[PDB]
Amino acid sequence: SSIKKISFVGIFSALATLVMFLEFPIFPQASFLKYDPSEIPALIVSFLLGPGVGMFVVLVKDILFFLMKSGDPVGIAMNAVLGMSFVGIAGLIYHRNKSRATAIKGMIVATLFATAFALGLNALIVPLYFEAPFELYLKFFPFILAFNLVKFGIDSVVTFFVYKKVSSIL
């Protein structure tokens, strides 16, 4: 039944939006970087149903969060762009031969791409957002690499240990 999958997707974008209110800065200096575990639900959906569906969960969840927090379109756009890359790369790698090996490799390749991708965009957004010299991005660089690494690392480890316990329940 597709309605069982629509239910699953609709449920998991609702939890992805709720859990986002738990955001907090891991680094008090780079306080604009806030961690939230909202992509663990999307990565589960990506793994159990397809990369495109998991990315769709990230977009629905961030749209809903922006309407409730309209004060930050820049900081939600970057979360949306990175979350869909991370959960997209991981699911595409993994679905070519569903196993833990390509689940593990899917999340590592996705984590390192999203982090480099973050560094490239965080290189272009930080000076504009703070109306500051490129100096400041280089000052933020060690926090940016460390943060998007811990964020998508913990999201990978958590997802890895939970998402087949989720396939059993279905």
Ligand X SMILES: Cc1cc2nc3c(=O)[nH]c(=O)nc-3n(C[C@H](O)[C@H](O)[C@H](O)CO)c2cc1C
Enumerate binding residues for ligand X (CB under 6 A). Answer: 32-34, 72, 74-76, 78-79, 82, 118, 122, 125-126, 129, 144, 148, 151
**Beta carbons of 78 and 120 less than 8 angstroms apart:** no
31 or 99: CB nearest ligand X? 31
Nearest to 91 by CA among 140, 44, 158: 44
CB-based contacts of 144: which residues, under 8 Å, 6+ apart?
30, 33, 118, 119, 122
15 or 125: CB nearest ligand X? 125
Classify residue 22 as exposed, middle or buried by CB count within 10 Å of its CB (0-12, 13-18, 19+): exposed
49 or 87: CB nearest ligand X? 87
Residue 78 beta carbon to ligand X: minimum distance, rounded to whole angstroms: 4
Residue 131 beta carbon to ligand X: minimum distance, rounded to whole angstroms: 12
Residue 16 beta carbon to ligand X: minimum distance, rounded to whole angstroms: 14
Residue 48 beta carbon to ligand X: minimum distance, rounded to whole angstroms: 23
13 or 122: CB nearest ligand X? 122
CB-based contacts of 47: which residues, under 8 Å, 6+ apart?
54, 90, 91, 94, 103, 159, 163
**40-51 b/e with 16+ CB inside 10 Å = b?**
bbbbbbbbbbeb
113 or 129: CB nearest ligand X? 129
Residue 93 beta carbon to ligand X: minimum distance, rounded to whole angstroms: 19
